[PDB]
Symmetry: C2
Subunit: 98 residues, 2 copies
Amino acid sequence: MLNRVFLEGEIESSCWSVKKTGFLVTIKQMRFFGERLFTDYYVIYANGQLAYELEKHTKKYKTISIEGILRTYLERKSEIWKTTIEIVKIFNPKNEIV
Amino acid sequence: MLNRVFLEGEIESSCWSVKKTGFLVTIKQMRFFGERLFTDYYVIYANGQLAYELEKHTKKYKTISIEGILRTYLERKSEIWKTTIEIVKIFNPKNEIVIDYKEI
């Protein structure tokens, strides 16, 4: 069904899967809401060839803007259902969206 | 910051915070894993007028589609930052949505 996410954030860290099947990148969104600042952390990822385009952006830019779908998965020897974004398209940092 | 989410699923459960500052709903979206049909669960919420719209849409429909903002909070234990969607807009369960973007 319907599932589209447009997210942009600052790159905090990133690494490969165990099998190095996919590249996970943690992005951060930090902002003032009321009298206080709230900071959000998101784990987006890419598989296949796209995991290399993702990893290169990591080496090039401090911020990333992507397109993708919301997903969750169960961490085995970890017990937890984690939420993440699977990337569909990375954007040109020098370009806006709308 | 670029932050927009469009999602739809089946309402699984929901509840009001203490001073009813907001209304929280938990949605299920079908997922596959090879040939196995499984499920994805998401937590969405709303404030003010829209919290009351949510609770009503909740006591009237099984599925729900929305437009929202992806947020997170810290699970101080597992130190995992959990994800929640701040509802911005609720759609008519009779309407086909349809997204796209530009590239200025």
